[PDB]
Amino acid sequence: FAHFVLIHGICHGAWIWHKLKPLLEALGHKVTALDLAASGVDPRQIEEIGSFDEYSEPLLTFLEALPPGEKVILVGHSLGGLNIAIAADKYCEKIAAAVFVASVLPDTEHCPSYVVDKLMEVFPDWKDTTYFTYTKDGKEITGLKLGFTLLRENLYTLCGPEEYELAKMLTRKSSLFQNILAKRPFFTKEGYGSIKKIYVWTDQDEIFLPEFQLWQIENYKPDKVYKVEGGDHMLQLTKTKEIAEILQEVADTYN
C-alpha cells in the first residue's frame, strides 16, 4: 500500500480532493490532503506570504515530520506541481514518486518561473479574475482571485453545479508569486531532478491547453505519461475513478 500526499493548486484547498481521498482509501492506501498556506481552512492570509517557498510550508512541515525510511507519493494539481519541486529540493529521499495531474511541470534547466511564463502566453485572458498588490519582505507581489466565470467555463467545465458551488464557496485569494519565482534559485538536478515523475493530462482541459500540456512533456520528459480521455481541468472531480486507477498503477510501480 502507498501513502499519497495530495497537493492542491493556487486559490484552492484540500477540499478539491474530497472525492478522490475516499476512493484511494477504499483501495487500502493512506492519504493526506494538505491545505497550503492561506488556503482552505489555513488561518493565514495571503498578504503574510512572501514567496512560493513560504506558501509551501505545510507541505515541507508534513514531510519533515515523516520518520526516516517512510516515503510518500506526492500528487499535485495545477500550480501544485511547483510546491512538489520545492518539497523535492529538500526531501527528495522521502519521495517515492511525484504525479502531476493537470499540473505545471517545472524543470532544472531554466528558472523556476519558466513554465508559468509559458502558461500566460498560451492562456493570457483570465476573464473575470481580479488582481491586487501587497508588499511583503520589501517586494511588491501581485495577488489574484480566480473569477467565477473563469472557474465555471475553464476549470469546472464538466463538473456538476454542486461541485462548482464548492469552488465559489471555498476558493480564496492567492498569488502566483511570478516575479519571486523568476529570481528564485533553479530547482536542482540532485533534488527535484532526481525524483520519478508521472504526468497525467487531458486534451479537454480548457485552461491548461493541449499546446501547453504537450509543450511541457517535450520540454522536460516525464518518466511516464497517462492521457485521460474526456473530463475537464478538475480531473480529480470529473474523472475520479480514472485518477485512482492511475495512482494505483503508480503505487504498484514505485513502492
Numbering used by the authors: 3 to 257
Task: Reproduce, without paraphrasing, sentences from the article in which this PDB structure was first reported.
Hydroxynitrile lyases (HNLs) catalyze the enantioselective interconversion of cyanohydrins and aldehydes/ketones. One example of an HNL with an α/β-hydrolase fold is the hydroxynitrile lyase from the Pará rubber tree Hevea brasiliensis (HbHNL). HNLs occur in at least four protein folds; this paper focuses on HNLs with an α/β-hydrolase fold. This fold consists of eight β-strands connected by α-helices and contains a catalytic triad, typically Ser–His–Asp. HbHNL and SABP2 also use the same Ser–His–Asp catalytic triad even though the catalytic mechanisms of ester hydrolysis and cyanohydrin cleavage differ significantly.
We report a 1.99 Å resolution crystal structure of HNL6V, an engineered variant of hydroxynitrile lyase from Hevea brasiliensis (HbHNL) containing seven amino-acid substitutions (T11G, E79H, C81L, H103V, N104A, G176S and K236M). Six of the seven substitutions replace residues in and around the active site with a corresponding residue from SABP2 (Thr11Gly, Glu79His, Cys81Leu, Asn104Ala, Gly176Ser and Lys236Met). The seventh substitution, His103Val, introduces an amino acid similar to the leucine in SABP2. The harvested crystal belonged to space group C2221, with unit-cell parameters a = 47.05, b = 106.38, c = 128.40 Å and one molecule per asymmetric unit. As this electron density near the catalytic serine Oγ remains unmodeled, this model should be considered a putative structure. The structure reveals that HNL6V maintains the characteristic α/β-hydrolase fold while exhibiting systematic shifts in backbone and catalytic atom positions. Importantly, the catalytic triad and oxyanion-hole atoms have moved 0.2–0.8 Å closer to their corresponding positions in SABP2, although they remain 0.3–1.1 Å from fully achieving the configuration of SABP2.
